[PDB]
Write a protein that binds this DNA or RNA. Structure first.
Lengths: 258, 205, 147
RNA sequence: UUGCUGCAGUUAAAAAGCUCGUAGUUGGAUCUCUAGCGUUUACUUUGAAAAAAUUAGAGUGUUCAAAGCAGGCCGCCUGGAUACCGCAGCUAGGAAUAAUGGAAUAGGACCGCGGUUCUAUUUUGUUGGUUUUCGGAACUGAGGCCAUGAUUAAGAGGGACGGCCG
RNA sequence: UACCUGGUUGAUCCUGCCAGUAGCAUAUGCUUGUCUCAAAGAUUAAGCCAUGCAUGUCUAAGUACGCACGGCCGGUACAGUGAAACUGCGAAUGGCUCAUUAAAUCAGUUAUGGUUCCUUUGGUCGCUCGUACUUGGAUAACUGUGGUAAUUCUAGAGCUAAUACAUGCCGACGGGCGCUGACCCCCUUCGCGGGGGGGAUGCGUGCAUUUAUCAGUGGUGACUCUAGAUAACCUCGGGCCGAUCGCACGCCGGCGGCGACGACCCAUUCGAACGUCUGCCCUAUCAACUUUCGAUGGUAGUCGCCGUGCCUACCAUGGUGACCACGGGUGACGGGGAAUCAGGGUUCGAUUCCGGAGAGGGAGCCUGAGAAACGGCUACCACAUCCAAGGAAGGCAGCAGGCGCGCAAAUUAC
């Protein structure tokens, strides 16, 4: 069609939001921002559907327009603003801080953090370039362009940024025997340790990840995010420890709890 | 409604293609800027992405580079002598990229004199008009005399350029698209290609 | 000239061929510096490319053509154009109703760099995808293997 | 009663009057790894990639059901699984089966040996002029060795010759 | 649930079809108590439409001298709510329908190292050495005089705004860095001469743009990548380098915090556009086709946001085809899917999600980041409305509704 699309049909929305069929015809339609439309989360969904604070669409803008909600220590009134992976949502009214981490089954989970941990965030560097009198530059997965990076930071490494400033505190290299998390494909939300990468020139690089419970799986390089140094994570994990336990013991656990 | 679409052409096999959509905007073209020699007349056209494109209708002056010693000067374009694509544009006096153009020799000669102090395009007997004598046979300190004496060895222009300087105009190939960029920039011809274009210009008539 | 067929002058755009040379080097010999690049996917640049005097803007080794996308093969069927050849690609299409195959061929025009000299019909050629070069040419010859 | 699985063609409807022949399809035994490889595929097994809705299918007393994605306990403990996704394109194992070729006027393999041209950019504390080797190529004048190199000869087929036969 | 039964004969065993049997969709007949869920002018005519409605919009924060309201305080430029109009943005999404369309659309897979991109989100924004304590002219709105039978028609007259439209400076600013270079110092030289420092006067300087040269900070599977150096260029149809607004007020005449509008350029998000490989129904009573007027390729340009016969010039004589080209037909939009069903299959898919296309038929274009837009304009062709006959105005395949067409499809509702 002519020009860009403005709407989004409800059934055409990405599955990990878990919008039901009958509520309406349209969906939230995440607006342009740091994270991709397919792999983000509108605040209207997070507030209304996940935290169960707002009932209707009006209550969400009535919350947001009173400027009670910050994303990465910055006030956002846009109810369809895309907050994606590693983004820290802060409610300073009720003093509640959330980090958006994918759960085992492959969706953003309502994972609370201490206010002391809502100071920094981890970020995967997309590229590294230099320009105009050679001040080198870095670009990350949440589109934060940072000047004068540490020259030890190469492409596909992770960096820890203080949210109040815009400067790198510490960084993790992408090497063998490092804790990573999958952010795309069948294995989305699984945490594990790198074993090796198999470089395919002129094509996608494939990496092999071993889980804590002896489960080994492969994934594309683009869908990898280093979260810890060695085996120890630099952030809190969700309810489960990123362990994909199968339907058999899912049933056994559920029936055991009953 | 000039169209640069593929779907109006026949297929590789040779069969006709029936069009499913009528002509779009992004498929448009525009009439050719048949850029003549004359005082600066440049029109601008608003293009895709809301950018501008400088359509030079009549150009007089452009800057060319002497690559062998690396010095670039603004010069009045004299005449178009040879065009590789089509011979009509040589008669119409039309400026396009990779067309051979006689240009004025003033600034290069003035640079050469001011740099080395060796006469170019001067005859055996022309009387030095009172202004150049304080560049050619000017006095200076022994350091600068020695510094210039060192440059004397290097400064040896090829025979092919001498007659052109003596005539007072150089052959120059245009490297900038004057229809799109809106200026007639390029380089003065030298060595193998100078000879190639000389024998080609001579062969044309 | 040997390399000079057309109306316009032929020369590699990166190469400058009008340096100030002193007589000790001028009268000694004459040789233009030949530009070549290494295409990435483990293909050795042929000696005739780094040694040759041919000028071709569509040669992947000695032109402005970057090889990216799919690497295919084909058998040469017609070498009857200027620096481009018609190659044939044979494959079996599986019909699931009958559970049998049918053989099909595709003829594609590929650009053949003038380095690949004394190459005959019938031998197999490995071709690389590049940006479009003409109406029908999208592929460039990377290496030849003799029948 | 459109037959790939799976149909008919002596008389029920049906084998061209007959032979040759290009394309098409099919085709006899046989051969037990040193950052680059191994002769290349088809085949088969695994991996990642592949929109939801739909379909299969887990959980849940819509009062039951078709449905829906909810709900349940006295502020709490939950769920919104999972599978399939032709073909083709990527990825790593297997090497039976089926195609293809590795040395035949030996410019054939493997080993040390003679020279022609050019070049690497370490070297004579740094710096300018000659000559070098080492690092790395095509061309060759010879030499040693290979247990040196051709599977069988189809109750497949062409051709040769022998005495007949109609 | 992997199913059969009647019908040729005087009777028999067959081949074989006609008939029966069940499901699914459209119509239609007669019948019709309760309750939930729910398709619905697709087929024929992408035929034609009266009428009403379907795209508008203001915050403390661009422009408030409409008394349209009352309110201070009365020498306080502007208390406030705010019609109207200028300015900004949107109207390219949504909705409808399936005429077109047969390697086209479209699907899975890859590429832009060959391109643009409003907006959001980051980066950048005294890095440039040369009236500022705020510059200029107009026009709406309003008032007043009008014309025409007529429309969301508009001319003339009198004022007045800017984040509209123009123009344009201090400051950072002291210098540094490349060149040109009279004069001064030092060592050797008897001296000539050779070698090493210091310099006032002129020239240019940053990012973006265009061209040529030199050297090889960070990256790629591979750059003619990115950055750096050098000589210059820089469009009067001019490119950045802020004459703008709001709330809170402070510190020893200046210095400031919190925002909002802007902005050249890079990154990002939403895309879009061109491509790569493989895949489509029937037809030989379509066997050779394409190349005069571009067919296939080569060199040079033009045009375009870029790659390219996209187009022009000059050359070559190619490119596809019984593995079905080319041509014709389609009661053909393509997929995700639907019905049926042992296993295999057959048939349908206008229709709610994705992609494409068109607004009666073609064609051309303004504005804009985005349109070859039709609830934008301009012309012709076909239909048709008003009329004082001079001229004016058209687009339901948006929602209702009507006519037509037909076997075939709902309310001018809130």
């Amino acid at each position: 069609a002519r020009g860009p699309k403005k709407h989004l049909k409800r059934v055409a929305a990405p599955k990990h939001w878990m919008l039901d069929k009958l509520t309406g015809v349209f969906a939230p339609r995440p607006s342009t921002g740091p994270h991709k439309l397919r792999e983000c989360l509108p605040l209207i969904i997070f507030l209304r559907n996940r935290l169960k604070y707002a009932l209707t669409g009006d209550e969400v803008k009535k919350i947001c327009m009173q400027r009670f909600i910050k994303i990465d220590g910055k006030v956002r009134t846009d109810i369809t603003y895309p907050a994606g992976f590693m983004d820290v949502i802060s409610i300073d009214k009720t003093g509640e801080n959330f980090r958006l981490i994918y759960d085992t089954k492959g969706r953003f989970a309502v994972h609370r953090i201490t206010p002391e941990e809502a100071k920094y965030k981890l970020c995967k560097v997309r590229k590294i370039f230099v320009g105009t009198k050679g001040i080198p530059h870095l670009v990350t997965h949440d589109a934060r362009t940072i000047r004068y990076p540490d020259p030890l930071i190469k492409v596909n490494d992770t960096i820890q940024i203080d949210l109040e400033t815009g400067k790198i505190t510490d960084f993790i290299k992408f090497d063998t025997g490092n804790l990573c998390m999958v952010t795309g494909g069948a294995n989305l939300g699984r945490i594990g340790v790198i074993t090796n990468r198999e470089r395919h020139p002129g094509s996608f690089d494939v990496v092999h990840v071993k889980d804590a419970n002896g489960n080994s799986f492969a994934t594309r390089l683009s869908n990898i995010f280093v979260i810890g140094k060695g085996n120890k994570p630099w952030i809190s994990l969700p309810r489960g420890k990123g362990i994909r336990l199968t339907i058999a013991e899912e049933r056994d656990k559920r029936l055991a709890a009953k | 409604g000039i169209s640069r679409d593929n779907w109006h052409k026949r297929r590789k096999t040779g069969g006709k293609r029936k069009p499913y959509h009528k002509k779009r905007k992004y498929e448009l073209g525009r009439p050719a800027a048949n850029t003549k020699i004359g005082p600066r007349r440049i029109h601008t056209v608003r293009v895709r992405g809301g950018n501008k494109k400088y359509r030079a209708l009549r150009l007089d002056v452009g800057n060319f580079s002497w690559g062998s010693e690396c010095c670039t000067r603004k010069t009045r374009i004299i005449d178009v002598v040879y065009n590789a694509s089509n011979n009509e544009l040589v008669r119409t006096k039309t400026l396009v990229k990779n067309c051979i153009v006689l240009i004025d020799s003033t600034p290069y000669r003035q640079w050469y004199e001011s740099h080395y102090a060796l006469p170019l395009g001067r005859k055996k007997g022309a009387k030095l008009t009172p202004e150049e004598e304080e560049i050619l046979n000017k006095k200076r300190s022994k350091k600068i005399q020695k510094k210039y004496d060192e440059r004397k060895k290097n400064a040896k222009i090829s025979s092919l350029l001498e007659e052109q300087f003596q005539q007072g105009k150089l052959l120059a190939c245009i490297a900038s698209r004057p229809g799109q960029c809106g200026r007639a920039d390029g380089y003065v011809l030298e060595g193998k290609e100078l000879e190639f274009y000389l024998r080609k210009i001579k062969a044309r008539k | 000239a040997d390399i000079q067929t057309e109306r316009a002058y032929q020369k590699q755009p990166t190469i400058f061929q009008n340096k100030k040379r002193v007589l000790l080097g001028e009268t000694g010999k004459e040789k233009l510096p030949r530009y070549y690049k290494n295409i990435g996917l483990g293909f050795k640049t042929p000696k005739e490319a780094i040694e040759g005097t041919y000028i071709d803007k569509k040669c992947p080794f000695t032109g402005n053509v970057s090889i990216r996308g799919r690497i295919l093969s084909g058998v040469v069927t017609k070498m009857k154009m200027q620096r481009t050849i018609v190659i044939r690609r044979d494959y079996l299409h599986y019909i699931r109703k009958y559970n049998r195959f049918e053989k099909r061929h595709k003829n594609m025009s590929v650009h053949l760099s003038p380095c690949f000299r004394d190459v005959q019909i019938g031998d197999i050629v490995t071709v690389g995808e590049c940006r479009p070069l003409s109406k029908t040419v999208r592929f460039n010859v990377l290496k030849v293997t003799k029948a």
